């Protein structure tokens, strides 16, 4: 039948999920790796040994062991990102939505979830691909990968805890999509990976790594980048954090084998409790276990790779949101709160400013303060809130992405940039948070097409336009349909630097996304810090 597909690793069987009016085929839970349990914890993944009989790919897989954020207990704005399935070490699975009837050879889009590398679940309702796969009639895959210590504990040198394990999990998922996706009606040659926050950084880390370049044709990076300040750490820093995780559990730190063996004896519950101790500083938008620039998975330093050109040269469609830093200010930054208009005082701005950029020195912090301050009104709670909102978004997302764009475009095979600035009409977050980090995914995944979700007519059109750009880009390698329609999304060029906004209003083509601020972050500050 159609719900039956024989893959290289065994026979699989899915189900007919109802998509709006029609229905679609979905294979939920296909194993692409041996459950990284036992001694397999912290180690590189292994291929899923072929099974006998028909695998039942009808129900959503297990989520990976991670931290649950009960910051706002029962708040649908936060709880909707928490793992909805059962967490478990046996979580390396993938899901596939195939347009019914099965296609002969259609475009494949593989989604890589975000979560600061410490969280993530391919099973979220905002990651539901029946709408996108059905609408654009493309095969849609959403993978899984170990997060936190389980997927990123990194003691360089040791073979049982090397490092980029979470990315190795993604690569194994992609290699399965490479070998087997043709049996589901997908074109292994026209496969494009796309992800948000840490997933986008992963998409970027797959575009840089040699062993991952021939498993995808194109790519998309939403609000993320391989060079983001929070995305990577040296092989020393990660090692420091591994040992710290150990002494936090009373482990023998004499050697790697003694450390690693100890952490493996611990319940997964135990690792998550002492995971945030791993944070050495005291800040905002900085995580625990993240990829390490190995010199294996990542040949040289990301910057070196960007300069020389050492990276997969295809076309990319990347971008950011208006307010990327907002949510990140709710976890400690003085004066902020979900329940108020979070008007910040001068002295609390200075405090927060010290938290947003934990790497700068006093003169660098003076440089940051002077840049993001209205001296004619240094006490305006709204301006101080916003300039602090902007310091987190630019430093942590917008500028690192604009730095990646320019470097890549020198060897890229075409580039498109967007700026999603529409605020969901049915948003449960506080007005002052603006267009939040991760709040574009529901437009990409077509949620607004579901009447029961309470979006506006103009919002369905925006999701349809965004779904279309995404799919057309995946197939064509250009968002713009040839000899059809009128709206022309300008190809980003290092010269004119054109990009477009993504809102429910006419197609507006802008240029130079946050250039004054990103010149400060990208060029100037780095210069200052080194001369001092």
């Amino acid at each position: 039948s159609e719900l039956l597909v024989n893959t290289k690793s065994g026979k699989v069987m899915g189900t007919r999920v109802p998509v709006l009016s029609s229905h679609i085929s979905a294979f939920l839970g296909i194993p692409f790796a041996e459950p990284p349990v036992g001694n397999m914890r912290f180690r590189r993944p292994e291929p899923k040994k072929p099974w006998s009989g028909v695998w039942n790919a009808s129900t959503y897989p297990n989520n990976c062991q991670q931290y649950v954020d009960e910051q706002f207990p029962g708040f649908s704005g936060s709880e909707m990102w928490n793992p909805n399935r059962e967490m478990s070490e046996d979580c390396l699975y993938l899901n596939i939505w195939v347009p019914s009837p099965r296609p002969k050879s259609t475009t494949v889009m593989v989604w890589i979830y975000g979560g600061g590398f410490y969280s993530g679940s391919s099973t979220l309702d905002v990651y539901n691909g029946k709408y996108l796969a059905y609408t654009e009639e493309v095969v849609l895959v959403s993978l899984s990968y170990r997060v936190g210590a389980f997927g990123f504990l990194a003691l360089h040198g040791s073979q049982e805890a090397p490092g980029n394990v979470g990315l190795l999990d993604q690569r194994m998922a992609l290699q399965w999509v490479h070998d087997n996706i043709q049996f589901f009606g997908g074109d292994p040659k026209t496969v494009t990976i796309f992800g948000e926050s840490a997933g986008g950084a992963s998409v970027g880390m797959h575009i840089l790594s040699p062993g991952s370049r021939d498993l995808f044709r194109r790519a998309i990076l939403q609000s993320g980048s391989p060079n983001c300040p929070w995305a990577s750490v040296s092989v020393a820093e990660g090692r420091r954090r591994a040992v710290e995780l150990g002494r936090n559990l009373n482990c023998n730190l004499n050697s790697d084998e003694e450390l690693i063996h100890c952490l493996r004896e611990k319940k997964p519950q135990e690792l998550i409790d002492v995971e945030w101790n791993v944070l050495p500083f005291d800040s905002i938008f900085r995580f625990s276990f993240v990829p390490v620039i190995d010199g294996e998975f990542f040949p040289t330093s990301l910057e070196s790779m960007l300069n020389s050109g050492n990276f997969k040269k295809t076309q990319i469609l990347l971008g950011v949101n208006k307010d990327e830093g907002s949510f990140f200010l709710l976890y400690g930054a003085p004066g902020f709160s979900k329940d108020s208009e979070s008007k910040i005082s001068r002295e609390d701005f200075m405090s927060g400013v010290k938290l947003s950029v934990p790497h700068a020195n006093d003169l660098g912090l003076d440089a940051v303060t002077l840049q993001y301050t209205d001296w004619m009104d240094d006490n305006n709670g709204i301006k101080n809130r916003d300039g602090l909102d902007d310091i987190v978004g630019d430093h942590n997302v917008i500028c690192p992405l604009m730095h990646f764009v320019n470097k890549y475009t020198k060897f890229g095979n075409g580039t498109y940039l967007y700026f999603f600035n529409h605020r969901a009409s049915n948003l449960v977050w506080p007005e002052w948070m603006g267009v939040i980090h991760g709040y574009e995914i529901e437009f990409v995944f077509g949620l607004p097409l579901v009447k029961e979700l309470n979006y506006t007519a103009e919002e369905e059109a925006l999701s349809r336009r965004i779904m279309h750009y995404w799919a057309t880009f995946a197939k064509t390698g250009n968002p713009n349909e040839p000899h059809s329609q009128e709206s022309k999304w300008p190809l980003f060029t290092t010269k004119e630097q054109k990009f477009i906004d993504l809102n429910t209003e006419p197609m507006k083509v802008h240029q130079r996304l946050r250039v004054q601020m990103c010149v400060f972050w990208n060029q100037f500050l780095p210069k200052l810090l080194n001369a001092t």
Binding site: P73, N82, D273, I284
Partner: protein, 61 residues
């Protein structure tokens, strides 16, 4: 006293603490993150910031 209850790997439920206190253990320094809730009021250190409240209900939010 109706209060929230959970761990770092659990979703917040609303169990009933008796005439006892409800805590809200967190990471003292930013990111000040909740690492647990429930009935009681354990000790802490520079790193942990336990916040005990006996009223009203849902006081350990």
């Amino acid at each position: 006293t109706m209060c929230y209850s959970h761990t770092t790997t659990s979703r917040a439920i609303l169990t009933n603490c008796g005439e006892n206190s409800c805590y809200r253990k967190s990471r003292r320094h930013p990111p000040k993150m909740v690492l647990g809730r429930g009935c009681g009021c354990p000790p802490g250190d520079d790193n942990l910031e336990v916040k005990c409240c006996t009223s009203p209900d849902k006081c350990n939010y």
